[PDB]
Structures are given as C-alpha cells and as structure tokens.
Amino acid sequence: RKIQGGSVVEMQGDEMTRIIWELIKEKLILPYVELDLHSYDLGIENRDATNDQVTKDAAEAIKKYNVGVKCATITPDEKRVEEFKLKQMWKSPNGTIRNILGGTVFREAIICKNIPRLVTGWVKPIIIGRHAYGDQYRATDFVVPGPGKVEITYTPKDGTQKVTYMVHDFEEGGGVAMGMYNQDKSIEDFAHSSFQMALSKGWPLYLSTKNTILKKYDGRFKDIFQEIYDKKYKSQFEAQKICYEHRLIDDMVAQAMKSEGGFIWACKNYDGDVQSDSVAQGYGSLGMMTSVLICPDGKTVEAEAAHGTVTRHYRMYQKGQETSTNPIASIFAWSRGLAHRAKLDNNTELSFFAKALEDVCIETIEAGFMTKDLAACIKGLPNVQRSDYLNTFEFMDKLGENLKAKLAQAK
Amino acid sequence: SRKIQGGSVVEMQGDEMTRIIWELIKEKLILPYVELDLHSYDLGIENRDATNDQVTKDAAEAIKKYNVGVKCATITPDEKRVEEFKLKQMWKSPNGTIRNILGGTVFREAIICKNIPRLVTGWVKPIIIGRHAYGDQYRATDFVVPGPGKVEITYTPKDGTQKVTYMVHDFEEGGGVAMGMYNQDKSIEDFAHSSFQMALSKGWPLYLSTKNTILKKYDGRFKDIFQEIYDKKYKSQFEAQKICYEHRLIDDMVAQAMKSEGGFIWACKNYDGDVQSDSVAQGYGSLGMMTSVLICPDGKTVEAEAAHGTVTRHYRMYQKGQETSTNPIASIFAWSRGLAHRAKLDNNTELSFFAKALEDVCIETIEAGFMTKDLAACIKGLPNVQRSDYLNTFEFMDKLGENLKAKLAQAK
Numbered sequence: 030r031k032i033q034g035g036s037v038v039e040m041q042g043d044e045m046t047r048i049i050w051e052l053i054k055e056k057l058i059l060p061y062v063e064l065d066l067h068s069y070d071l072g073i074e075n076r077d078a079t080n081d082q083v084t085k086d087a088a089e090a091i092k093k094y095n096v097g098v099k100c101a102t103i104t105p106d107e108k109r110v111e112e113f114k115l116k117q118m119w120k121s122p123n124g125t126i127r128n129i130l131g132g133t134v135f136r137e138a139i140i141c142k143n144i145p146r147l148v149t150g151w152v153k154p155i156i157i158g159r160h161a162y163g164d165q166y167r168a169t170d171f172v173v174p175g176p177g178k179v180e181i182t183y184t185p186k187d188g189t190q191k192v193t194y195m196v197h198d199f200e201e202g203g204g205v206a207m208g209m210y211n212q213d214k215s216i217e218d219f220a221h222s223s224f225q226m227a228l229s230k231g232w233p234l235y236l237s238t239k240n241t242i243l244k245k246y247d248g249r250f251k252d253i254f255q256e257i258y259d260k261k262y263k264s265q266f267e268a269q270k271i272c273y274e275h276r277l278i279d280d281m282v283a284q285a286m287k288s289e290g291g292f293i294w295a296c297k298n299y300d301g302d303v304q305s306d307s308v309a310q311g312y313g314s315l316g317m318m319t320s321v322l323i324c325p326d327g328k329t330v331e332a333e334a335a336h337g338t339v340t341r342h343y344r345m346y347q348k349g350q351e352t353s354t355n356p357i358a359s360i361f362a363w364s365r366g367l368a369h370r371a372k373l374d375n376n377t378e379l380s381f382f383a384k385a386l387e388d389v390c391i392e393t394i395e396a397g398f399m400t401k402d403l404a405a406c407i408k409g410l411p412n413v414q415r416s417d418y419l420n421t422f423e424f425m426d427k428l429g430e431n432l433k434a435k436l437a438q439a440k
Numbered sequence: 441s442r443k444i445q446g447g448s449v450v451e452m453q454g455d456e457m458t459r460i461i462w463e464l465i466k467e468k469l470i471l472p473y474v475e476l477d478l479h480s481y482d483l484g485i486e487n488r489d490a491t492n493d494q495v496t497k498d499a500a501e502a503i504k505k506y507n508v509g510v511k512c513a514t515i516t517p518d519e520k521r522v523e524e525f526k527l528k529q530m531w532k533s534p535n536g537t538i539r540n541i542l543g544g545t546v547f548r549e550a551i552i553c554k555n556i557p558r559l560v561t562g563w564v565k566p567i568i569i570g571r572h573a574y575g576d577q578y579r580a581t582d583f584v585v586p587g588p589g590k591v592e593i594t595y596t597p598k599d600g601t602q603k604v605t606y607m608v609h610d611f612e613e614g615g616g617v618a619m620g621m622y623n624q625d626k627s628i629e630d631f632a633h634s635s636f637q638m639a640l641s642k643g644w645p646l647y648l649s650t651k652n653t654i655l656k657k658y659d660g661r662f663k664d665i666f667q668e669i670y671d672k673k674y675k676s677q678f679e680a681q682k683i684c685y686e687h688r689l690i691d692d693m694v695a696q697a698m699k700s701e702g703g704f705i706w707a708c709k710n711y712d713g714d715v716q717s718d719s720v721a722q723g724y725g726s727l728g729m730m731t732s733v734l735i736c737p738d739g740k741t742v743e744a745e746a747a748h749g750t751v752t753r754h755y756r757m758y759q760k761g762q763e764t765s766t767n768p769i770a771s772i773f774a775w776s777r778g779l780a781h782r783a784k785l786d787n788n789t790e791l792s793f794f795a796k797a798l799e800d801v802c803i804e805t806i807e808a809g810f811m812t813k814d815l816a817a818c819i820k821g822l823p824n825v826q827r828s829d830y831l832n833t834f835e836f837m838d839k840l841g842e843n844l845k846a847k848l849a850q851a852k
C-alpha cells in the first residue's frame with residue numbers, strides 16, 4: 030500500500046523548476062504517498078488565462094487546508110509580457126499569497142559535510158526570518174511623467190485630523206514615485222515569531238533596520254520588537270543565556286559576514302529577500318536553501334524553494350544543451366510541507382517518509398553524487414570536469430533509486 | 441612655507457571615534473607636509489544641533505564652490521541620540537543632506553593588502569560599487585499611521601491637467617507605518633552615465649541590480665534608462681573593449697557577486713549600495729579598508745569619505761579607559777583621494793605625489809606586519825589574536841607617521 034497523506038495544496042510553476050517539479054512528483058512522491066492533492070497551475074500562461082484568479086484561489090486553499098507546497102513562478106515585467114503575449118504585467122504570485130496569509134518566511138541553508146563554503150567562518154547555521162508582509166512587495170509605484178507635485182495623505186476613519194505630506198515637487202522633468210506601508214499587527218506577529226524561533230534554537234536574535242534614515246517607519250519595527258521583548262521574552266532569553274539586539278542593516282550584514290553563524294536574523298521583507306540569497310550562496314548554493322512561510326495562526330505553512338525558476342538553465346534546456354540544475358531545495362519544499370501535514374495529523378508514517386526524503390538527499394550528496402553547482406563548491410568552477418557531477422535527470426534518477434532502497438530497507 | 445602648497449579643500453569634522461582619528465591624521469600625516477586653504481565645517485552632532493543643521497547645508501555649498509570635500513563620519517540621530525545629547529530635533533543624516541544637494545554616484549572599493557586573507561574565498565579581482573547617491577529611502581517622507589484610515593498618494597501635474605490619486609492602503613484594523621519616496625529622471629541618467637564611464641575606464645563589465653519584477657514602474661525606470669543609454673551611447677565602446685552590460689535582479693546579483701572572482705562594476709540603487717558596500721568591505725577584510733568617493737555629475741566636484749560610521753562601540757571603549765584598535769586607513773584615504781583630486785584640478789605635481797605616497801605608506805605598513813586588531817584577526821582568526829599581533833589606534837597612527845616621514849624624506 031501507499032502512505033495515506035491527507036490534504037496538501039500544490040502550486041505548479043514555470044521554466045526549469047516546473048520540469049524538476051514533474052520529476053520530483055514522478056520519482057520521489059507519487060510512488061509512495063497518496064495525497065488529497067489540491068493542485069493549482071500557477072504557470073504564467075494559466076495565470077494569464079484566468080486573469081490571475083488561480084493565484085488567489087490557491088492562497089485561499091492554503092488557508093483552508095493549512096499546507097501548501099509551491100514551485101517557483103515567473104513574475105512578469107515588460108520582456109515577459111512580450112514573450113508570453115500577456116494581457117497585463119501580473120503581480121508576483123508569491124506577493125499575492127504572502128499578502129493574504131501573512132507571517133514570517135524562515136530560510137536556512139541545507140548543509141552537507143563535504144561541501145566547502147564560500148564564507149570561511151560559518152560553522153553554525155544562520156536562519157533568516159523574513160517578514161512576509163508589506164513594504165516594497167505591496168507598494169503603489171508609478172512613473173511621474175513631468176513637472177508636478179507628489180503628495181501622500183492619511184485620512185483617519187474616525188474624522189480626526191487629515192494629514193498631507195509633501196513627497197516631492199518635481200520642478201524640472203519627471204521621474205518615479207511610490208508609497209508603501211506596513212501594519213502594526215503584522216509587525217507584532219513577526220516579532221513574536223522571531224523571538225520564539227530564537228528560543229526554540231537557543232540562539233541570539235538580531236533585528237536589522239535603517240531606523241536612522243527611516244526614523245518613523247523603521248523606528249516602528251525597532252520599537253515594537255523592543256516592547257515585545259521587554260514584556261514577553263526578556264526573562265526567557267536571560268534564562269537560556271541568549272540575547273536580542275537591534276543593529277543597522279549595513280552594520281548587520283558585515284557582522285553576519287564575519288560571524289561564526291548560529292543566530293536568528295529578523296529581516297524586513299526586502300532585506301530578507303536579498304540577504305537570504307547572499308547567505309544561501311555563502312554556504313554553497315541557492316539550490317541548498319529551505320524556505321517556509323509560517324503564518325501567525327500557528328498551523329498554516331507554505332513551503333517553497335528560495336530560488337526562482339532558473340531561467341538561464343531553462344534556456345539551455347530549450348536548446349537541448351545539457352543542464353545540471355540542483356533540485357534539492359524543491360525537494361525540501363515537498364518534505365517540509367509533508368512533515369507539517371504529518372505533524373498536524375499525527376501521521377507517523379508520513380513523518381517517517383518526509384524525514385527519509387531529506388536524509389536520502391544529504392546522504393547522496395555526501396557520498397559524492399551531486400549536481401554541478403555543488404561540484405564547483407568542492408573543486409572550484411575552473412577545475413570542474415563533467416565526470417565530477419550528474420546532470421539534472423541523472424541526479425533525480427540517483428535520488429529515486431536511493432529513496433527506493435531506503436524505504437525498502439526500512440520495511 | 442616650504443610645505444606643499446595644496447590649495448582649497450572643504451573639511452567636514454565628525455563624531456566619536458572617527459573624530460579622534462581625523463585629528464590624528466591632520467596632525468601627523470597632513471599638516472606637517474601640506475599647506476592648505478582649509479574651509480572647515482564642524483559637523484559634530486553638538487555643532488549641528490547648535491546651528492539647527494545649517495552648518496551641514498553651508499558645507500555642501502562650499503563643496504560646490506571649491507570642488508573638493510573631505511568628510512569625517514557623523515552621527516545620524518534617532519530617539520536614543522536625541523536623549524543622549526538633548527537634541528532640539530531628530531536631525532537628518534548629514535550624508536543624506538549633502539548628497540541630496542550635490543547628486544552623483546558614490547563609488548566604493550576595498551583597499552587591498554597582499555597579506556590580509558579574505559572572508560570570501562573567490563574575490564581575487566576588485567569589485568567596485570557605484571551607489572546612486574540621490575533619492576529613494578534617503579529622501580523619503582515616512583510617518584506613523586496612528587489607527588484605521590486611508591493612505592493615498594497623489595500626483596498634481598504642474599500644467600494644470602487632471603490630478604491622479606492612487607490608494608496605498610486602507611487600514612481597517614489598527615495602524616502601522618507608511619512612506620512615500622521618489623527619484624528623478626535626470627539623476628537616474630547621471631547615475632547611468634557615471635556607471636558606464638567607470639566600467640569603460642576600468643575595463644570591467646557593468647551590472648545593474650534592481651527589483652523591477654516587483655517595483656515594475658519605479659525600478660523599471662532605472663532598468664529602461666540604463667538600457668537606452670547603453671544602446672545609444674556605450675554599447676559599441678563596450679564591445680570594442682570586450683566587456684558587457686547586464687541588468688540582474690538584486691537577489692540573484694548578490695549571490696552572483698558572492699561566488700564571482702570579482703572584476704566588475706556593480707551599479708546599485710541608493711539603499712542596496714549602502715548595504716552591499718558594507719558586505720563587500722567585510723568580505724575582503726574590514727570596513728576600515730574601503731574607499732568611498734562621491735563623484736558629482738559635473739565631472740569636477742568630489743566628496744571623499746570613509747564608508748564606515750563613527751565606530752561608536754570603539755568610542756565607548758575609549759570613554760571607559762579600555763584600549764582601542766580602530767583602523768584609520770579608510771579615513772586616511774578620504775584625505776588622500778580628496779587631495780589627489782585637488783591636485784588633478786590644479787595640475788599640482790607635488791601634491792599628486794604626496795597623495796599617492798600617503799596611500800602607499802598605508803599598504804606598505806600593513807604588509808610589513810604593522811596593523812590594527814581587525815586586520816590581525818583576518819590573519820589569525822579572532823580567537824587566536826594576541827596583543828603582540830597588533831597596534832592600538834594611537835600606536836598605528838604613530839607608525840604610519842614615522843613611515844610617511846621616512847618615505848617623503850627619501851623622495852627628496
């Protein structure tokens with residue numbers, strides 16, 4: 030028989046990651062697990078065909094069933110509009126989903142003992158907690174076509190004072206302008222999730238902002254974190270001999286670079302996006318990073334890879350050129366989603382399966398079978414020969430055989 | 441005097457640890473050898489408070505007049521600084537004020553010593569960041585939203601045509617924060633030109649990072665302006681020099697930079713240039729080993745500075761009687777880069793030599809094994825550093841002064 034899995038929302042994506050997603054389902058998931066699978070095609074063509082409604086439907090399903098696993102998707106700009114003959118420049122599906130669900134996206138490298146790092150000192154993990162809501166990812170931006178005034182206005186619902194602020198008087202020429210925002214409740218949730226994560230690991234917590242420049246906007250993040258620390262977590266931190274500190278973002282990225290690792294890093298939405306790619310690459314590869322959205326309700330999660338659709342590799346695939354794209358992050362999206370589904374349902378056999386999936390990945394790499402990005406970590410990209418790595422399909426096949434043998438040997 | 445006649449330089453004095461080092465540089469390395477027409481503006485936090493920040497605006501206008509400014513790091517106050525100095529207001533960053541007036545691109549690059557290991561294994565060639573100096577978060581209008589209500593952003597054309605209003609957010613429960621920011625086409629164009637010109641002058645490829653998939657209009661404008669200027673002015677020159685230009689999304693770019701061998705110009709928007717220049721400095725060795733020069737669009741006016749701040753944490757050690765070992769090199773190169781530009785403008789051969797000698801002394805001293813604790817930790821690892829591995833802040837300044845005196849004496 031197969032493992033009885035329960036309800037999981039699956040979102041299919043684009044380009045190289047869509048292909049890998051198909052390989053993962055066929056070789057690693059479907060032969061072993063039967064799921065009540067609620068599938069949503071978030072491929073760019075289906076999003077366009079449905080006027081992006083499929084994205085909103087998917088987010089609602091994640092809230093209902095509490096577990097989503099998402100493949101990387103194209104976020105279109107003008108070049109993608111021309112490529113796919115799109116009706117609109119659709120918004121990022123990740124931004125739409127995260128805007129609805131809220132929460133914190135936690136990202137962490139996937140570590141193999143035989144893979145050298147690019148950053149010499151990082152002997153312990155760095156976990157980024159990326160605030161998943163607002164800021165640049167729900168902004169209202171526009172081109173200023175010529176001379177004129179841009180202003181921003183707040184009108185309270187309760188008929189107290191309305192306030193209009195000058196953004197800029199464009200005296201010559203035009204430019205660009207934007208408004209963005211965040212919400213107190215969302216920032217509070219983000220603080221709680223950061224403090225709880227630090228206590229769960231027994232590691233210090235650092236929050237980064239630029240509150241010397243954005244004194245009101247970023248100052249609010251710093252103030253809410255400090256109030257929540259003092260009122261809810263200071264004594265527990267002191268019990269575990271860990272600390273909480275706010276640092277300016279430019280100081281903090283330098284401190285991270287020279288650290289030994291072993292800390293939680295609470296990042297605003299944009300910083301979390303950018304620095305999670307820097308951290309993933311510092312440890313090894315973007316293909317070796319986990320990403321999980323933990324919603325404030327303590328039960329809903331969305332797992333994904335931190336990287337995109339790997340367009341550059343897909344262009345090689347389209348030309349029939351051999352590719353070696355790392356599928357591990359995509360595989361860990363499935364394993365982390367299934368592990369959460371099993372934790373919610375006390376599903377012992379699914380818990381075992383999800384862990385075995387992750388173990389097979391690490392064991393395969395550490396035994397010396399890997400894609401080109403990891404071979405380059407070991408050898409250096411100049412010294413990498415074709416015999417040092419497997420292409421994407423050979424690697425998927427090797428994982429498939431190693432998983433089959435692990436599940437067989439366990440029963 | 442028989443000193444080098446150096447000409448007119450605008451000096452802005454600063455705060456905390458860098459203020460201490462700044463005075464040591466002037467007394468030990470500059471004033472013994474160079475006579476300057478020095479236009480000094482005290483941008484210390486107490487004097488900015490006493491002048492209601494007017495000293496900062498006056499300094500910026502002086503840089504416009506004399507074309508050369510050298511700036512010490514300054515405190516940008518938040519609420520805690522208001523309390524510590526009993527400030528009248530939460531003053532704006534002086535860097536932001538000066539850059540907003542001058543415009544241009546801030547170019548940042550590590551200062552490389554052959555005996556100093558990197559934290560990033562692959563960076564064998566230089567990475568030069570060109571940070572757009574104007575606008576975005578550093579000229580933003582931000583505010584607390586005290587409760588439910590609507591935030592909207594409006595554009596009113598100057599020529600009387602129809603005003604446009606866009607919703608930013610309808611706050612339905614609780615409050616939050618909101619902000620507006622902007623940038624100007626002319627400033628973006630100047631940023632593009634300076635970036636393409638730096639790439640051609642160094643002979644390296646150029647990369648622009650944005651997040652135009654998310655900020656499709658705002659960041660798309662940067663991407664479009666760069667591409668149109670590249671196509672119509674620089675592409676044939678790039679191809680002749682066998683270099684290229686590419687736009688990349690910022691999160692891809694930071695990973696590409698991490699695994700690269702170096703050897704590229706990196707055009708960054710104001711905020712990214714701020715953050716990633718600290719990441720790059722640390723990756724090569726230390727925040728104390730990075731140059732920073734604002735190059736204005738007029739092709740004549742520059743403001744040189746260190747990329748790091750006032751090093752408050754070391755200043756607190758100094759205040760409590762604990763030995764400090766703060767790296768002065770970036771501050772020294774602020775002087776040397778400023779004086780080099782002064783000399784280029786004036787065709788002042790002796791001053792050009794002096795400015796280069798100053799930089800050579802710094803490198804030669806560290807390579808000879810005399811260095812502050814940050815660089816000793818690069819070599820040994822911080823847990824293995826012993827007091828005999830490094831010099832304290834004043835000892836290192838003295839050693840630089842001895843070596844500079846000796847170099848200039850031999851030169852004659």
Ligand SMILES: NC(=O)c1ccc[n+]([C@@H]2O[C@H](COP(=O)([O-])OP(=O)(O)OC[C@H]3O[C@@H](n4cnc5c(N)ncnc54)[C@H](OP(=O)(O)O)[C@@H]3O)[C@@H](O)[C@H]2O)c1
Pocket residue numbers: 100101102103104105123314315316333334335336337338339340341342353354355356358402653689692695
């Ligand atoms: N979560 C998401 O849905 C998400 C995230 C980011 C971007 N995107 C979309 O993805 C598309 C491509 O964006 P992008 O090219 O900037 O970013 P990307 O897909 O993350 O790829 C950037 C580069 O990182 C490396 N890389 C990433 N994932 C890898 C993997 N699994 N194995 C090996 N190398 C890997 C490759 O470097 P080399 O070229 O050096 O081999 C690749 O070209 C865009 O349409 C973007 O909107 C979506």
Ligand SMILES: NC(=O)c1ccc[n+]([C@@H]2O[C@H](COP(=O)([O-])OP(=O)(O)OC[C@H]3O[C@@H](n4cnc5c(N)ncnc54)[C@H](OP(=O)(O)O)[C@@H]3O)[C@@H](O)[C@H]2O)c1
Pocket residue numbers: 241277280283512513514515516517535727728745746747748749750751752753754765766767768770814
């Ligand atoms: N250019 C400017 O005017 C400028 C730039 C940035 C910040 N600031 C102001 O500077 C003040 C302090 O900011 P901050 O603490 O975030 O940043 P910072 O002054 O850059 O110092 C951050 C940390 O970087 C290291 N570091 C920086 N410069 C160093 C040097 N020359 N030698 C050795 N180590 C060095 C030290 O790390 P360790 O503690 O690990 O030794 C230091 O504590 C704030 O008031 C801020 O507004 C101004």
Ligand SMILES: [Mg+2]
Pocket residue numbers: 302303306335691
């Ligand atoms: Mg990203």
Ligand SMILES: [Mg+2]
Pocket residue numbers: 279714715718747
């Ligand atoms: Mg900075």
